[PDB]
Amino acid sequence: VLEDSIGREVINRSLIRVRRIRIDRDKKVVETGGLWSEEYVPMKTIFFSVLLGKESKESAIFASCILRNLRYVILGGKETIGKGIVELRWVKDVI
RNA sequence: AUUGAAAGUUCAAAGCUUAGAUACCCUGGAGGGAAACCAGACUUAACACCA
Numbered sequence A: 001v002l003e004d005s006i007g008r009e010v011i012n013r014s015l016i017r018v019r020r021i022r023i024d025r026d027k028k029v030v031e032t033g034g035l036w037s038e039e040y041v042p043m044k045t046i047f048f049s050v051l052l053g054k055e056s057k058e059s060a061i062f063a064s065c066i067l068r069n070l071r072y073v074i075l076g077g078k079e080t081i082g083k084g085i086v087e088l089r090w091v092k093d094v095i
Numbered sequence B: 001a002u003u004g005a006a007a008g009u010u011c012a013a014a015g016c017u018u019a020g021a022u023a024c025c026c027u028g029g030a031g032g033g034a035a036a037c038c039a040g041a042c043u044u045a046a047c048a049c050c051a
Helices: A004-014 A057-066
Strands: A016-024 A029-040 A072-074 A085-087
């Protein structure tokens, strides 16, 4: 756990910022303006969130039947690059 | 009983192409195969005398 000034530099250095290219398939060179830049969040990163539920009978099924079987889901975009496989861990058993 | 409810910035995209670790460069200059060394040492034995 770093100070907020030093941590913001160390964290910004873990963020993956790549350039990406679209290639002219006939001459195998990059197109004009076929270069752009994207940002990814690395493997093993950990986001924390909460799922709040109102009192009902459907949520009892949802929290018991549905939420137990969510281990892996896919968030965000660029799934073709394989950029969405994420894992939920449900802080009620890891504690 | 909330200007509330509902809605995935999603999708397609190769950091690709061109590019000789090449060019100059005497293993050279200096350094005595020298220093020392007797071709020398010695007569013996037998013997007729002596004894």
